[PDB]
């Protein structure tokens, strides 16, 4: 399937590009992650279903309401209030989302020149940060009430930034040369 | 040098003001006691880098480095000493005085040199070839410069036991 074309397109391609004794030693993808974070300044109980609906429709999975850590502060910080929207994608659905990005999230972009190339972790396996929601295959501005922005971390069992770099490059991620 | 007794009882030691002592290593850590004034002339002549021979009234000389003295807080006099018997592999982590050479050009325009670390503990000095001092030329230094351990030159077979980046001597401004 769309994965095994990914692994054998890369798994030999990295075992060929780089020596690893084991097919298990090739970097993989542990999980896609989306932090939504909706209403992190907008205290919208009406919009809690907003981001919940947009995420559950565009992501083929139910989202959880990452509640405020309870570090109440000078500003509008408090314990038990909802503050963000987490969704973890594993396996089949994570591959479907990575394909929706690689085949419609790069066409979706405005003014593309790549994505930022300096790997985020020192351990690798890192996180795209959406700056706008207008151009996703599921996020229509007409059906949507208003524009918003989400987050999409992705984990990889790469041991270094260079290795997940080569893996995410061969897999179909654009790069900012 | 010379020393005689080493009873567990100390009442004899205080009267003739002779310092208490010990000598130890891996094999034998036997305690002893020796004369005071000759010990102080010797400890003046050599510090923690200097060494001397002890001739316990048993007929065999031994070669000792000085390792620690612990003495009276009120009276300034030294109380107790710990000489260290040393095999001729490099003595462990010996301390070396810092000393400055030249008239620094930082001193000539209102500054003054300040030795931020009066002793530097280097590992593997090499016994019998120990550095009894450590000259550092400060003439290049201007006000606000730092001569770190990455500068201090070393003799044979020596490697600094302290972090090289650490500040050693520094010139300082007025006031």
């Amino acid at each position: 399937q769309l994965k095994t074309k990914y692994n054998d397109q890369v798994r030999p391609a990295l075992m060929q590009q780089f020596g690893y004794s084991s097919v298990m030693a090739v970097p993989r993808i542990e999980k896609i992650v989306v932090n939504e974070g909706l209403g992190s300044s907008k205290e919208d109980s009406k919009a809690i279903d907003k981001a919940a609906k947009e995420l559950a429709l565009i992501t083929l999975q139910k989202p959880i309401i990452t509640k405020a850590k309870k570090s109440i502060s000078n500003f509008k910080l408090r314990q038990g209030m909802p503050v963000g929207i987490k969704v973890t994608l594993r396996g089949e659905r994570m591959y479907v989302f990575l394909e929706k990005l690689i085949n419609i999230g790069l066409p979706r972009i405005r003014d593309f020149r790549g994505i930022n190339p300096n790997a985020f972790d020192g351990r690798g396996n890192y996180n795209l940060g959406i700056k706008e929601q207008l151009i996703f295959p599921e996020i229509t501005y007409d059906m949507v009430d208003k524009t918003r922005g989400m987050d999409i971390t992705i984990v990889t069992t790469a041991k270094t930034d260079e290795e997940a770099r080569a893996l995410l490059q061969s897999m179909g991620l654009p790069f900012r040369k | 040098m010379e020393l005689t007794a080493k009873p567990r009882t100390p009442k004899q030691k205080l009267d003739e003001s002779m310092i208490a002592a010990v000598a130890y290593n891996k094999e034998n850590n036997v305690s002893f006691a020796l004369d005071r004034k000759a010990f102080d002339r010797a400890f003046r002549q050599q510090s923690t880098t200097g060494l001397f021979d002890i001739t316990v009234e048993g007929g065999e000389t031994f070669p000792a480095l000085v390792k620690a003295v612990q003495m009276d807080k009120r009276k300034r006099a030294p109380i107790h000493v710990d000489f260290y018997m040393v095999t001729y592999g490099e003595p462990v982590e010996v301390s070396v005085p810092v000393h400055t050479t030249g008239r620094s050009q930082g001193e000539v325009q209102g500054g003054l040199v300040d030795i931020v670390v009066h002793n530097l503990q280097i590992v593997a000095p090499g016994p019998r070839r120990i550095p009894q001092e450590l000259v550092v030329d400060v003439t290049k230094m201007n006000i606000g410069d730092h001569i770190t351990a990455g500068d201090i030159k070393l003799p044979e077979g020596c490697t600094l036991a302290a972090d090289p980046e650490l500040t050693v001597v520094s010139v300082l401004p007025p006031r």
Binding site: - | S47, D72, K73, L112, D114, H118, N119
Partner: protein
């Protein structure tokens, strides 16, 4: 001088000091011989004297510090409510404790500076150059 800190008031007794019998910083050091409190302005007068004699030059360290609050009941009352809220901060000082130590000044001028500073301290005190030293 006064600390910016914690509980207002304390107690009091004595035993010979441990936390600084040896002169780490600098060349020479004046050193206490008696167990008095030292407190604030007594030190600060030592500081201002030595800074007059030496400054434009030299390095002055004050290894002692007014930690301990001391209290005065008001005016003239009977043993009444509680203790008295304020008055002055002190530093306990036991013999062999080092209060002072100069840098970058000739032996003789350090003599004269220690003499001036010690002519206004409750304790008598003795100066020394640093012998051989250990504790690192």
């Amino acid at each position: 001088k006064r600390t910016k800190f914690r509980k207002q008031f304390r107690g009091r007794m004595t035993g010979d000091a441990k936390g600084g019998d040896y002169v780490a910083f600098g060349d020479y050091g004046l050193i206490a011989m008696e167990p008095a409190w030292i407190k604030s302005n007594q030190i600060e007068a030592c500081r201002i004297v030595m800074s007059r004699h030496f400054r434009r030059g030299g390095k002055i360290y004050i290894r002692i510090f007014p930690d301990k609050p001391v209290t005065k009941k008001p005016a003239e009352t009977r043993m009444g409510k509680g203790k008295g809220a304020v008055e002055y901060w002190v530093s306990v000082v036991k013999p062999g404790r080092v209060m002072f130590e100069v840098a970058g000044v000739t032996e003789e001028q350090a003599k004269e500076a220690f003499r001036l500073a010690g002519h206004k301290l409750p304790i008598q005190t003795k100066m020394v150059k640093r012998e051989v030293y250990d504790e690192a």
